């Protein structure tokens, strides 16, 4: 069985408020 | 049916971004995350409002009782 | 003109004691048109 | 002992940023009892102007009248809330609305087919005329003294690009909307902030030295500008706590399970405020402070 | 690779202009294929 | 009408009263209770909302003596006003500084 396809190009989306 | 004026959770006005989202998806070859970020939607509560909108109003509008078909 | 044919969508005035049908085509269904009237609402 | 002077000695404010829509700042050496009071007043008690009473004259569009009135109530209006007074609800409908508390917006738009549209055109803006209704179409109809008082600043939506409705040929919308002062604790349309909240300043207490490659991975467990490697000794130190979003990814490794404790500064609030558009965020905060003070003064002067 | 996609542009284009050859969802018709085919078998098919 | 003294709970000497405030919630209740608990003379202070669907706030103040619950309430309200004034002034100072 092939593992579930890992999505690519995953970057940071959450930043502390005001930044 | 038609894009909501505001995000349900926080209240940020997201009703003026649906057409821009479609433009950035079609003209620019942007993925959905990039387009949502470039619209200014950081919170996932605001992102979902545009990422998951269906826009059934267009399909409703094809049934026009006031114009000959 | 207070009625709309349900198929050809042409505005038509239906007098009383008159045949209920579109004049242009032979359709027996008519839709009452919405005329200008004050209708209050709450933006809530 | 606690005193107003002892609070005034230690309380301080650190404005991190300030725009016309979003203001990020800090409240230090204050209690959650007062920070939460400010946040709640900002969300619910600070007044703004939104559409309340809609008088439809025709709506042959697919969107129904109540939905359209709700959307028109949601769109924020660039009105200074001080420029109009409060509606006296007990007065009769005739004399309830006046030129000093009500703002009249109108929306008249008919869709006609474009007879010059190219064959094979799928764009509604090219096929039809006025196939889209926007908030910018909400004209402002001044009446009475506001024809002079609002001459300096006409009333327009803060977001004119809000897509109110869509039309098809033959269909039309004709309505008037009355805009009055209200607060967000009544209806969420009067709330003047996209969101106002705070968060305690995170604390990252490093307990044991993290010298070596462990510093590289320990620093890898936080947002980019939170942990740094000291130039002199290869040691990890806390550069900026405000940059940390508390995600406890460091706790997920047993390597650092006894090298760091994550806590908070229970008096160091980082207020993040966004404005819907009618008022600046700094003025929103100032109004909330004033509201708390005025309500306390009203209680003080109320006979018991 | 992405496990699933919203197909936003495709969906909105199809909403704007319904297909002129066939529906884009063949599986939605095989669901009612039993009833349609049963009613069809009583006028057409072999043996009259 | 805004502020009411609940006579069934007040003390004869006035050192333990209970107040019902209309159109108030945690926003004022918690701030006022925190500020009143700064008076070194008050023994017990708390706030309760009888029902969330009603906009009624209850404040209890019990003093050790030498004051009353009404006087403690007045002191807490004035201290809250001064706290708001200092917050406003410091915020404006930092705004002008920038
Ligand atoms: Zn949101
Ligand atoms: Zn007809």
Quick one: tokens of D57? Answer: 């004259």
Sheet holding C30-32, edge to edge: C11-12, C3-5, C30-32
- Distance from the first to the final alpha carbon of chain C: 34
For the domain that residue C29 is a member of, what is the CATH number? 2.20.28.30
Three-state secondary-structure class, residue D211: coil
Domains of chain D: 1-47+189-304 (3.30.1360.10), 48-188 (2.170.120.12)
In chain F, where the domains are located: 1-98
Task: Give the length of chain D.
Answer: 304
253-292 in chain D: CB under 8 A from chain C: none
- Residue F69 has a CB neighbour count (10 Å cut-off) of 26
Q: Is C9 exposed, middle or buried (0-12, 13-18, 19+ CB in 10 A)?
A: middle
The radius of gyration computed from the CA coordinates of chain C, to the nearest angstrom, equals: 14
Cα–Cα distance measured from residue D88 to residue B30, given in angstroms and rounded to the nearest whole number: 51
Residues in chain C whose C lies over 2.5 Å from the next residue's N (breaks after)? none
Using CB atoms, which residue from D58, D66, D189 is nearest to C36? Answer: D58
Does B1 contact chain E (CB < 8 Å)? no
Q: Is the dihedral of CA D27, D28, D33, D34 positive or negative?
A: negative
Centroid of ligand 2 to alpha carbon of C8 (angstroms): 4
Do F66 and F41 meet the contact criterion of CB atoms below 8 Å apart? Answer: yes
Q: Which ligand is nearest to the CA of C8?
A: 2
Give me the CATH topology for the region F1-98: Gyrase A; domain 2 (3.30.1360)
Distance, in Å, from the CA atom of C29 to the CA atom of C7, rounded to the nearest integer, reads: 8
Which residues fall within 8 angstroms of residue F8, CB to CB, at 6 or more apart?
Answer: none
Chain D residues in contact with B44 by the CB 8 A cut-off are none
**Which residues span the domain enclosing C24?**
2-44
Phi, psi dihedrals of residue D210, rounded to the nearest 5°: -115, 40
Using alpha carbons, select from D176, D163, D177, D175 the residue that is nearest to residue D130: D163
Find chains touching chain E: ≥3 CB pairs under 8 Å. A, B, D
Q: Dmax of chain D from CA atoms? A: 83
Q: Which residues have a Cβ under 8 Å from the Cβ of D168 and sit 6 or more positions away?
A: B61, B64, B66, B67, D61, D62, D111, D128, D131
d(CA D134, CA D148): 27
Taking the C-alpha atoms of residue F69 and residue A9, their distance in angstroms, rounded to an integer, is 64
Ligand nearest to the CA of C9: 2
CB-based contact, C31 to chain B, within 8 Å: yes
Residue positions counted in chain B: 69
Q: Per CATH, the architecture of B1-66 is what?
A: Orthogonal Bundle (1.10)
User: Under the phi-then-psi rule, with left for phi > 0, alpha for psi from -120 to 50, and beta for the rest, what region is A14?
Assistant: beta
């Amino acid at each position: 069985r092939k593992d579930v396809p890992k999505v690519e190009g995953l970057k940071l989306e959450h930043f502390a408020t005001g930044y | 049916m038609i894009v909501p004026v505001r995000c349900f959770s926080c209240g940020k006005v997201v009703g003026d971004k649906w057409e821009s989202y479609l433009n950035l998806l079609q003209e620019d070859e942007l993925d959905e995350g990039t387009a949502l970020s470039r619209l200014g939607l950081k919170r996932y509560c605001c992102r979902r409002m545009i990422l998951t909108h269906v826009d059934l109003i267009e399909k409703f509008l094809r049934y026009n009782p006031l114009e000959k078909r | 003109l207070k009625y709309i044919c349900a198929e050809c969508s042409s505005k038509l005035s239906l007098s009383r004691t008159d045949a209920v049908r579109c004049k242009d085509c032979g359709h027996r269904i008519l839709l009452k048109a919405r005329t200008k009237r004050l209708v209050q609402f709450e933006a809530r | 002992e606690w005193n107003v002077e002892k609070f005034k000695k230690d309380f301080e404010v650190n404005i991190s940023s300030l725009d016309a829509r979003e203001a990020n700042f800090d409240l230090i050496n204050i209690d959650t009892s007062i920070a939460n009071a400010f946040r709640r007043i900002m969300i619910s008690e600070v007044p703004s102007v939104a559409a309340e009473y809609v008088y439809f004259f025709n709506n042959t569009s697919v969107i129904q009248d109540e939905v359209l009135a709700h959307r028109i109530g949601l769109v924020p209006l660039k009105v200074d809330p001080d420029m109009l007074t409060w509606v006296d609800s007990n007065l009769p409908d005739d004399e309830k609305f006046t030129d000093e508390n009500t703002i009249v917006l109108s929306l008249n738009v008919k869709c006609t087919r474009n007879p010059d549209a190219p064959k094979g055109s799928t764009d509604p803006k090219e096929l039809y005329n006025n196939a889209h209704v926007y908030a910018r179409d909400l004209k402002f109809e001044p009446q009475g003294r506001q024809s002079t008082t609002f001459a300096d600043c006409p009333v327009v939506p803060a977001d004119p690009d809000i897509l109110l409705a869509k039309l098809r040929p033959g269909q039309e919308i004709s309505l008037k909307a009355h805009c009055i002062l209200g607060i967000g604790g009544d209806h969420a349309k009067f709330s003047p902030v996209s969101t106002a909240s705070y968060r305690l300043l995170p604390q990252i207490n490093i307990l044991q030295p993290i010298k070596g490659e462990s510093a590289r991975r320990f620093q890898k467990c936080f947002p980019p500008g939170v942990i740094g490697i000291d130039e002199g000794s290869d040691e990890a130190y806390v550069k900026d706590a405000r940059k940390d979003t508390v995600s406890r990814e460091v706790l997920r490794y047993e390597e650092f399970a006894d090298k760091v404790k994550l806590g908070r500064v229970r008096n160091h609030f980082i207020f993040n405020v966004e404005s819907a558009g009618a008022m600046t965020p700094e003025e929103i905060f100032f109004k909330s402070v004033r509201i708390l003070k005025n309500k306390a003064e009203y209680l003080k002067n109320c006979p018991i | 690779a992405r496990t699933a996609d919203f197909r936003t542009l495709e969906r909105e284009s199809r909403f704007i202009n319904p297909p002129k050859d066939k529906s884009a969802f063949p599986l939605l018709q095989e669901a009612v294929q039993p009833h349609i085919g049963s009613f069809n078998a009583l006028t057409e098919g072999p043996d009259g | 009408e805004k502020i009411k003294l609940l006579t069934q709970a007040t003390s004869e000497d006035g050192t333990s009263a209970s107040f019902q405030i209309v159109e108030e919630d945690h926003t004022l209740g918690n701030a006022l209770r925190y500020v009143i608990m700064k008076n070194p003379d008050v023994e017990f202070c708390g706030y309760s909302i009888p029902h969330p669907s009603e906009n009624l706030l209850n404040i209890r103040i019990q003093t050790y003596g030498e004051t009353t619950a009404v006087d403690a309430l007045q002191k807490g309200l004035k201290d809250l006003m001064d706290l708001c004034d200092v917050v406003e002034s410091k915020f404006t100072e930092k705004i002008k500084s920038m």
